[PDB]
């Protein structure tokens, strides 16, 4: 409908979304059902490409795509992205509706993602801040005298953008934007569970003038994508997902430029001098936002003895005063989780914590195949490390609360999980803050706020199991671009007179 | 002897070099013979560590190494490196002798490598040019108003430095320098065929004060190293080697920060307006230097019709007027190749070129198990692409000569090999040069000079099969360092008044 | 009319433009006539402010202006500039008409300036590339251990933008843009000879939402402006004008941040390997464009013996085939000069050159009080240096042609004038080009093109008598901004453990 | 003696130091007596150059100096500076003795300055961090398509370094270092009151190989220097001194690149959450160090009601427990002031403060023509602004103490003086600190430490009356260097295919 006018095929009741094969929308591979977490019903179908079509798509992106993307001057790429922003913006409601239906995202959360995608597109201009090379004079070494060097960046060619389910619209728009702004062609591979927003975005981009042979959207399920990652024409792979899949991706890909945003949870530390209202409010939000289905969600709260009581109490009040329902009621605070499987795991993890000495302070009640109350489990420092909610990432609205003696204990506990994406610290003392910033092994630390990557105005990425490299405005250039050095030799040519 | 005073064990005639286990020199694993390519004789032995020692070494580097390297202020790390430079410099002759004997490197070439290693150490100060973070103000987006960001770099922890045989001293010193200057611990794994210089370098570094638990040298053969690369305590892997091993390394390593210098040959392009004396001289040198056992060696020469004759003729004269012998005679220009196996391949490749229409213009005669004449094979443009000397990298003193109609043919031929390390272009016209610089898919282009990475004053690395990422003074920081973002929230705190 | 709706006062026949006093349009000082160079007729009048109003305007800009400009977040400043671009763009024809009438600018040249002003405003986003501070860690010196540093930029406060007559619209828009984008208030002082475009631009900016107390436009004549420059509330002075006035400005201003674009002519060098069609075409244009009333105009042509003949001949053909008339006929190539005084000087300078051995190769005929033929005077190298057309800048469509033996003579002659704004060099050889780039003492060198600052996509400014500092997208930040260093002390606070 | 072996002329009892005239030590102008503030005795004499010698020196620096400095590759300039560091270091005691005798500097303070000068010289390598140009691609604007830009820095030529009396050794070494490291020649003009250290430093530099025609040391008194500043061959003027002289310097110099470090005092703010021991200790030191003859000396202390009592009390104890004597006793804490005139002013200023409601809390007693007790005067907020000790900079060991209600009052008082060099803030709360950092109009803010420029590891400079631009490692490049832009035109040359 609308954007996907002549694209969506209305086959026997359910709308069928085809893959975009770098030139034409189509696909002759298996058809796959797409369901809503709101009622487990099949809301549409997607056509996956055949091995022959995947192969043909890659051949196109590699042979023509790289050149039409690279040979379109930046000023036009910028215009394409801005026009794509205009198109998505006027279709805001439709984009939002699909997010609410397909991802079970609360209405306002879905509207936020569309706006984030629109802004990312419009701010492509800011990505230019990291454009420009280095001039290296050669008279600072005898061996390089009368020599000179120029270093600049060049697009790698074809970038594979693999995307998660929790931000089906933004991640696709993001990776496409930074890959394309520098001159690359892109193969987008969305989560097969909610590939509709990506299809809509790509259509808006194509309508905006995005070189038709420089982009692709393949509805491939899981391991079917390995075919793309393992191919030599794919010079870079931008992957946002789970640690386990990310690992499999590199082992399949081999030598190549990578950006691995592998998430995991995020710990939050509250110091005795923190504004507890701000902290309680922000931590509660960081715990339940989009049913905790955020990589930058808060999964552990560590508070110093003196404020632990109030803090945990306040966060508990907030979490239980939440309304869990269908994402449509602008009254509902929390919608469903992407699958009943996800809820099972959350329940199991809560039982595990309880068995190991944990006590539920809020939530805990499952309300349906895909509905649960955001839960807050208190745990003694001496037992938390063996709890599943600690050792692992339970993608759900659930966090642990742990009392700590001082900053050092907070820090060692915060660093005790295998991940290191972000960390939040609420407090006022510059010294304690500086110490925490140095010792927290994470890609980013949020001072007096909950972790929120937003559109990447500030760069983010992981450490430890959370991955490698960063995404951000300007910073993502390092992942879809390679350096090119030009060394000029003027030895004895009389440019310099011994210097 | 000297540096390796109480380290080398004189066991029944041949000196035995032990591995350095992050604290003590030792090893209780198999012993391996080290031979000279000059006479196939066993000149020494190296003790490899046992699985238990490898494991224990990693535990040390990870638990104590990262902290003693990171907690040694930069000013002291700098002093350590400078003192290490002094030590190697006064032991220049001994270092050189081992290179000549162990790697078959011509005396002056071995002396050059020692001096390169000394300079790299002394210029660690220049690596600081890429130290410093970014301050990102937040009033350039409504969502980030009254917000602020700081981005800086942090050492990853433990870096594994895997090294090739052709620059056994420099590569080890290089990777150790840039890994350590930023606060990392290092596990060095030298080629098991010539691990002596690395052992000497590490000793000089340890003598200079390099934190004893922050460095390691393991004499592990090939696949025995996979154990190190696959370990989670190894946050980065700096690998310089063949495309094939590099690929295996990443597939074993998984998600991690990588620098892959995978070589391959380098094409050289001569334009009709080039200074043929300079070009002939530089190309000849780029072909035979260290028996072509240089990743940045010239493997293909492409000259435009009008100068092709003179050029090829002059380069042929130069190559055949070369003296091939024992690397010791300062009179010998070319020493042996690292193994008879290497010579076999060169011979096979020359026969292949000849069978496919190629003609030998210089050299071609094998002089012994590990000795050969640097060879120059002319080939018609219409047949060169299927020749082994073209499709592959024959690590030996051998290059192809191909006449071309114009710049575009030179460029497509130059880009026709699977590699893309460097490329040389000799000419004068800025337009033709600019075109070639844009279209040559290589990490670096050398204008009017032969490709020579030197000590990395200018950054270098590959494209296509030549690998990913770069090494260089200042630039290598990006491979052994990770970003850390600190976002400060002052919303409503009165720092700004709506701005 | 239109923009200046309720602003322009229709007093007895001629439209009267008032000054903008940081809040209200007005002025109670002397009225001054504004004439057209097309017919010496009074086309309007401007109201200059009284000493009391100047004083009051400064008090406003300083006390309220700095804060309303600084406290308007960048994202809004950007919106203001973009909206101002929209307003000027829809009023393109009116803006152009005033330029043609008030400055005698050829229709297409006037249209170009309006478009340049619109683009400058729209690209303010690119100025952000030089936004961001430096983080300086302190462990690289013993004295600074456990210490840390942050360096960033801060707006100076009130910037005085003084403008020339030859780009009455662009210079005003330019200085206002870069001054405002970083948070400064601005006092614009246009040339009293053509202050109408500035008034229109300021109105478009005010309509766009530019903080009303953060900007000012004072119609002050020459020395009347000294009052502004000498004031302590004016933290920076951005001056584009003649060397002589610039000098007086600093001597009146004292200690303050300055940008002095003082022009002078530009020499052009043609090498024997240059494309003479390109060179002839570009040099001819650089000589006559806007009647040579461009600071980056070509005033001297130096060609090597072998191409000198053709080149000079071709440029002569082009200059004489030019149509001189009223700037309105899109058929006229060259309009009038800003004043009859300017033509007198050009005539005197041509006679001087002739008396000193020069020969006219094209032009030379005066056609009216303010009309002349763009002139090309050939001069022997041994006599050119004493000619007025060489030693001085004759702001008119006139250049000298000098034959030279080689590059070195071209370079010494090019460096022989007292100025050093830009220089053009046409040729192909990288070596000769590199030499010329190193030895030409000018702010910018244009390779194979005529000097053209455009909107400052590339930064420009002078050397020698041409001034100091630079203007450009991103670069101008250095002139209206100051550094602020924050040094944090954590000595003995346990952030670091000796490091 | 020693360094000044054949330089110092022993004329009738007192050693006579000649000026260095860019090639030979000499001078045929008036002789001037140099006295010690320790006993008002004439300890030596300096020979000033004659107008003819000044003129000849400038001609040399301009015609040969710029080229021998610029044509000495950086690697050698670096060696010169390092060798100069070695020479000064072995002559440490002699250098220190002259400082103690000639400047009345306490033994340990004099030793610190020599060590600072040695380090500055040795760290010249760090100044390279800001070396390197920018490559600007042209496809981000239609007008600049197929165009390209390179921006780099170039030395200005001859830099005039004018120096104060309070750091006669360091300032001279500093300005010489950053001016020379980039390729400039230098004219040093030391304070005629203590020009001996400069002479010694220049000798050490000349001995180290500093191009003999690229440096000069002229013993000119005050206005005699104007001759240098006003000259066109002097492209930049690096001046550290009083606001009043700085102003005169620019008005005499005209258009030129400037760095004006004009000092003034520094306010210190203590927040209720500050570590009062640290603050008391650091503020006391910032007040008395070198008899307050430091531009970064603390002249005003502002403490919040709750800690004001303890703080002021503790600082008073510290100041009065100080030993005032001859700088030689390593037991003496405070030596004399440079002149009896300076003490008179301090006394007058203290009486003024007292008359206006101020009360002395420590010191106040003059002990001789050039000796005084470091004084601490308490003043009510409602009267301090009219006190001389507030409105002006009394170069002496004297500061005001003012109780304030909150941060905003502290900030407005701190910003109330006409200067804005540095500011210190002691406290712990990030919010209050961030606010103070934003609103303090000074070049640098020191958090939890006294203001101390040191060797400029962190850049510093003024705002308001404290001057313009910055000095620092890396940052000073902006003052003795100019940009050079090279724009290459490839329009229609086939480098790009519409991009
Ligand atoms: N791109 C550049 O900048 C650059 C620079 C220099 C050389 N090169 C290239 O690299 C090659 C260097 O010579 P080389 O013959 O020694 O090549 P190589 O065999 O690929 O060198 C491999 C290094 O990796 C180790 N290794 C082998 N198998 C491994 C495994 N499975 N897991 C982990 N590590 C393993 C090797 O140890 P063992 O000795 O025990 O096998 C050796 O230290 C040449 O092809 C050259 O073109 C590239
Ligand atoms: Na692969
Ligand atoms: Na792994
Ligand atoms: Na002034
Ligand atoms: Na002047």
Short mmCIF file of C-alpha atoms in Angstrom, two decimals, chain D residues 169-394:
data_model
loop_
_atom_site.label_atom_id
_atom_site.label_comp_id
_atom_site.label_asym_id
_atom_site.label_seq_id
_atom_site.Cartn_x
_atom_site.Cartn_y
_atom_site.Cartn_z
CA UNK D 169 64.66 31.50 30.54
CA UNK D 170 61.58 29.45 29.77
CA UNK D 171 59.67 31.97 27.68
CA UNK D 172 62.68 32.53 25.46
CA UNK D 173 63.30 28.78 25.04
CA UNK D 174 59.60 28.14 24.47
CA UNK D 175 59.01 30.72 21.75
CA UNK D 176 62.29 29.75 20.09
CA UNK D 177 61.36 26.09 20.13
CA UNK D 178 57.91 26.31 18.56
CA UNK D 179 58.99 29.01 16.13
CA UNK D 180 62.00 26.97 14.96
CA UNK D 181 60.55 23.47 14.93
CA UNK D 182 58.26 24.50 12.04
CA UNK D 183 60.95 26.22 9.96
CA UNK D 184 61.07 29.86 11.11
CA UNK D 185 63.96 32.18 11.93
CA UNK D 186 63.66 34.05 15.28
CA UNK D 187 64.45 37.46 16.76
CA UNK D 188 64.39 37.16 20.55
CA UNK D 189 63.98 40.36 22.56
CA UNK D 190 64.28 39.67 26.31
CA UNK D 191 63.28 41.99 29.14
CA UNK D 192 66.18 44.37 29.49
CA UNK D 193 66.03 43.78 33.26
CA UNK D 194 67.12 40.12 33.16
CA UNK D 195 68.44 39.23 29.65
CA UNK D 196 71.21 36.95 30.85
CA UNK D 197 69.39 33.60 30.76
CA UNK D 198 68.24 34.30 27.16
CA UNK D 199 71.85 34.97 26.12
CA UNK D 200 72.90 31.68 27.73
CA UNK D 201 70.07 29.75 26.07
CA UNK D 202 70.84 31.18 22.62
CA UNK D 203 74.48 30.21 23.08
CA UNK D 204 73.47 26.67 24.02
CA UNK D 205 71.24 26.60 20.88
CA UNK D 206 73.99 27.96 18.63
CA UNK D 207 76.41 25.40 20.08
CA UNK D 208 73.83 22.74 19.31
CA UNK D 209 73.86 23.65 15.62
CA UNK D 210 71.00 26.13 15.35
CA UNK D 211 71.50 27.81 11.92
CA UNK D 212 73.67 30.83 12.91
CA UNK D 213 71.86 33.25 10.61
CA UNK D 214 68.42 32.01 11.65
CA UNK D 215 68.42 33.40 15.19
CA UNK D 216 69.00 36.70 16.98
CA UNK D 217 69.06 38.09 20.51
CA UNK D 218 68.79 41.88 20.74
CA UNK D 219 69.25 43.63 24.08
CA UNK D 220 66.90 46.49 23.25
CA UNK D 221 65.09 48.45 25.96
CA UNK D 222 61.31 48.82 25.80
CA UNK D 223 60.31 51.11 22.92
CA UNK D 224 63.60 50.40 21.15
CA UNK D 225 62.00 47.08 20.21
CA UNK D 226 59.07 48.73 18.37
CA UNK D 227 61.54 49.01 15.49
CA UNK D 228 61.44 45.19 15.18
CA UNK D 229 57.70 44.71 15.62
CA UNK D 230 56.90 47.40 13.03
CA UNK D 231 59.11 45.84 10.34
CA UNK D 232 57.58 44.02 7.33
CA UNK D 233 60.17 41.25 7.41
CA UNK D 234 58.74 40.19 10.79
CA UNK D 235 55.74 38.02 9.79
CA UNK D 236 54.68 37.10 13.33
CA UNK D 237 55.09 38.49 16.81
CA UNK D 238 54.94 36.19 19.85
CA UNK D 239 54.49 38.50 22.86
CA UNK D 240 54.15 37.56 26.53
CA UNK D 241 53.81 40.64 28.75
CA UNK D 242 51.48 43.26 30.23
CA UNK D 243 48.17 44.19 28.61
CA UNK D 244 49.35 47.75 28.06
CA UNK D 245 52.55 46.88 26.21
CA UNK D 246 50.81 44.20 24.19
CA UNK D 247 48.31 46.79 22.97
CA UNK D 248 51.13 49.14 21.95
CA UNK D 249 52.84 46.25 20.14
CA UNK D 250 49.89 45.50 17.86
CA UNK D 251 49.24 49.20 17.17
CA UNK D 252 52.87 49.47 16.08
CA UNK D 253 52.91 46.16 14.22
CA UNK D 254 49.72 46.41 12.17
CA UNK D 255 48.58 43.41 10.11
CA UNK D 256 50.57 40.35 11.16
CA UNK D 257 50.02 37.02 12.91
CA UNK D 258 50.07 37.52 16.73
CA UNK D 259 50.05 35.51 19.97
CA UNK D 260 49.42 37.81 22.91
CA UNK D 261 49.82 36.28 26.35
CA UNK D 262 48.93 39.35 28.46
CA UNK D 263 48.38 37.75 31.85
CA UNK D 264 46.56 39.57 34.65
CA UNK D 265 45.72 37.64 37.78
CA UNK D 266 43.65 34.49 38.25
CA UNK D 267 40.63 33.95 40.52
CA UNK D 268 40.21 30.73 42.52
CA UNK D 269 36.78 29.39 43.49
CA UNK D 270 36.20 27.01 46.37
CA UNK D 271 32.94 25.07 46.50
CA UNK D 272 31.40 23.80 49.74
CA UNK D 273 32.30 20.24 48.74
CA UNK D 274 36.00 20.96 48.08
CA UNK D 275 38.87 19.21 49.84
CA UNK D 276 39.92 22.23 51.90
CA UNK D 277 43.41 20.86 52.62
CA UNK D 278 44.15 20.51 48.94
CA UNK D 279 42.55 23.87 48.20
CA UNK D 280 44.25 25.73 51.05
CA UNK D 281 47.60 24.24 50.14
CA UNK D 282 47.23 24.93 46.37
CA UNK D 283 45.75 28.41 46.78
CA UNK D 284 48.45 29.46 49.26
CA UNK D 285 51.07 28.27 46.79
CA UNK D 286 49.33 29.98 43.86
CA UNK D 287 49.38 33.21 45.83
CA UNK D 288 53.04 33.35 46.94
CA UNK D 289 54.96 31.28 44.33
CA UNK D 290 57.93 33.37 43.11
CA UNK D 291 56.58 36.31 45.10
CA UNK D 292 53.34 36.27 43.11
CA UNK D 293 55.36 37.30 40.05
CA UNK D 294 53.51 34.73 37.98
CA UNK D 295 50.90 35.62 35.37
CA UNK D 296 48.96 32.56 36.50
CA UNK D 297 49.17 33.62 40.15
CA UNK D 298 46.01 33.54 42.27
CA UNK D 299 44.84 37.12 42.97
CA UNK D 300 41.32 36.47 44.24
CA UNK D 301 39.84 33.69 46.30
CA UNK D 302 36.07 33.17 46.35
CA UNK D 303 34.66 30.65 48.80
CA UNK D 304 31.09 29.65 49.58
CA UNK D 305 29.75 30.63 53.04
CA UNK D 306 30.04 27.10 54.58
CA UNK D 307 33.78 26.58 53.97
CA UNK D 308 34.93 30.19 53.71
CA UNK D 309 36.00 30.32 57.36
CA UNK D 310 38.23 27.24 57.45
CA UNK D 311 39.64 27.93 53.99
CA UNK D 312 40.69 31.53 54.55
CA UNK D 313 42.03 30.62 57.98
CA UNK D 314 44.14 27.73 56.63
CA UNK D 315 45.50 29.82 53.75
CA UNK D 316 46.39 32.56 56.20
CA UNK D 317 48.30 30.13 58.42
CA UNK D 318 50.24 28.88 55.41
CA UNK D 319 51.11 32.35 54.09
CA UNK D 320 52.40 33.65 57.40
CA UNK D 321 54.44 30.53 58.18
CA UNK D 322 56.53 31.45 55.12
CA UNK D 323 60.22 32.44 55.30
CA UNK D 324 61.15 35.62 53.38
CA UNK D 325 64.84 36.13 52.64
CA UNK D 326 67.61 35.81 50.08
CA UNK D 327 66.63 33.31 47.34
CA UNK D 328 69.83 31.35 48.07
CA UNK D 329 68.91 29.79 51.49
CA UNK D 330 67.03 26.66 50.37
CA UNK D 331 65.23 27.54 53.61
CA UNK D 332 63.81 30.80 52.23
CA UNK D 333 60.36 30.37 50.70
CA UNK D 334 60.04 33.82 49.15
CA UNK D 335 62.75 36.00 47.63
CA UNK D 336 62.58 39.65 46.51
CA UNK D 337 60.40 41.31 43.88
CA UNK D 338 62.06 42.47 40.67
CA UNK D 339 62.09 46.12 41.78
CA UNK D 340 61.34 48.39 44.74
CA UNK D 341 58.77 50.03 42.48
CA UNK D 342 56.83 46.76 42.46
CA UNK D 343 56.73 46.69 46.26
CA UNK D 344 55.55 50.30 46.47
CA UNK D 345 52.56 49.38 44.29
CA UNK D 346 51.74 46.36 46.41
CA UNK D 347 51.77 48.52 49.56
CA UNK D 348 49.60 51.18 47.94
CA UNK D 349 47.17 48.51 46.75
CA UNK D 350 46.92 47.02 50.23
CA UNK D 351 46.24 50.41 51.76
CA UNK D 352 43.59 50.99 49.09
CA UNK D 353 41.86 47.72 49.91
CA UNK D 354 41.93 48.53 53.62
CA UNK D 355 40.55 52.03 53.06
CA UNK D 356 37.72 50.52 51.03
CA UNK D 357 36.72 48.13 53.79
CA UNK D 358 39.36 45.46 53.51
CA UNK D 359 41.09 43.67 56.37
CA UNK D 360 44.56 42.06 56.26
CA UNK D 361 44.50 38.39 57.28
CA UNK D 362 48.20 37.66 56.76
CA UNK D 363 51.33 39.56 55.77
CA UNK D 364 51.24 43.26 54.95
CA UNK D 365 54.69 44.11 56.25
CA UNK D 366 57.29 45.45 53.88
CA UNK D 367 60.77 44.17 54.83
CA UNK D 368 62.99 46.23 52.54
CA UNK D 369 63.27 48.04 49.19
CA UNK D 370 62.44 44.78 47.38
CA UNK D 371 61.11 42.52 50.16
CA UNK D 372 57.54 42.01 51.44
CA UNK D 373 55.42 39.42 53.18
CA UNK D 374 52.99 37.61 50.90
CA UNK D 375 49.67 39.29 51.88
CA UNK D 376 46.07 38.01 52.13
CA UNK D 377 43.36 40.70 52.24
CA UNK D 378 39.76 39.86 53.12
CA UNK D 379 37.11 42.02 51.49
CA UNK D 380 33.31 42.20 51.58
CA UNK D 381 31.66 41.24 48.27
CA UNK D 382 29.85 44.61 48.22
CA UNK D 383 33.13 46.54 48.11
CA UNK D 384 35.79 44.40 46.46
CA UNK D 385 35.02 45.43 42.86
CA UNK D 386 36.27 48.99 43.41
CA UNK D 387 39.52 47.90 45.09
CA UNK D 388 42.76 48.22 43.12
CA UNK D 389 43.72 44.64 44.06
CA UNK D 390 40.61 43.63 42.11
CA UNK D 391 40.37 46.02 39.14
CA UNK D 392 44.07 45.70 38.42
CA UNK D 393 46.90 43.22 38.42
CA UNK D 394 49.32 43.97 41.27
#
